[PDB]
Nucleic acid binder design. Sequence first.
DNA 1: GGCAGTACTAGTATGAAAGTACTTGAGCTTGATC
RNA 2: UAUAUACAUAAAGACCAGGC
DNA 3: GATCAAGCTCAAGTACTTAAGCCTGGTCTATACTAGTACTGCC
Lengths: 50, 48, 115, 51
Amino acid sequence: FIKDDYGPESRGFVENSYLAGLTPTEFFFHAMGGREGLIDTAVKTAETGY
Amino acid sequence: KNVTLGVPRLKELINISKKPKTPSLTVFLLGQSARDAERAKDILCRLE
Amino acid sequence: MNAPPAFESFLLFEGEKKITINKDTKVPNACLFTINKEDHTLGNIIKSQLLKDPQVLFAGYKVPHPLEHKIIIRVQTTPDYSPQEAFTNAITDLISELSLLEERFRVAIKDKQEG
Amino acid sequence: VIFNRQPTLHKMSMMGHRVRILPWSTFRLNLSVTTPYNADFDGDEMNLHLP
DNA sequence: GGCAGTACTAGTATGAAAGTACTTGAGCTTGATC
RNA sequence: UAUAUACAUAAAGACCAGGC
DNA sequence: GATCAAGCTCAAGTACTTAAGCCTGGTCTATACTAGTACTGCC
Ligand SMILES: [Mg+2]
């Protein structure tokens, strides 16, 4: 992407559905949004248990 | 207005920590300053 | 290490009766058959032969659990027709069907070869 | 038997059961019972304490 | 043939926590004395 | 003929990997 | 009436205690220094 692109594609909006398949970058951003799910689930359990 | 919720807010109430991440105070207005936005912004300037 | 023997499905050991007949107290003329070491092959034939008998009000089977091999067949007939008679006529009627099918399949073979 | 799964978050995660003995190697339990223990069947394990 | 020195082996000796509570130091106020 | 061979030992700790 | 000293309170800095539950596997566990004993070489 070009510097200072605030458009929907550059900032992570994925316009494809799992069926048509994600394009390369949308695959990476989709992986960045899923890492935040894995991390929370690993962190919160040890706090909710203490 | 971003406030803390979920488990991070639960440690605050339980531990009764002196300094919460997000202290907040809701304020209600009595007279005509409640209905009018202009009369309200006046009190708004007095609290800030 | 706990896997049951393969033969344990179709073989009876000492003391197990093949069939066990217990009357059913909920209902008049209702009987409940218990067949050890059988499965849906045998149970389904009979049920479907009992429902042709117009003097049979109810017939059905179930395998209580798949890991233990037995069938449980409830039969309810009309008065003055015994549910043990219903279940015997069912078995003799299949034998008279399957003996007719094995003879008709042998004729179609000889016809089929060189004919 | 009493029957457990860790961690025990509330008290529905220890409930007394009534044994029935079946072959092969795994404890077997009704599917409605998988709501309290919060256990789905993929490689899970559950303790058994015989009073 | 015996004694001394050196080497080897065996045993013994030693960045990317956070928060709360307590203690110490400094500053301010009051009292006493000149 | 009688009588006898009865159970104990694999330490503990450290880090590492995985499971739910 | 003013100045100095003492006492009390407040704020800041430093130190001490905790960070999920159960379970299965594996690999690996001192080194260095000193003292004593044995063997070899030389007188
Ligand atoms: Mg699971």
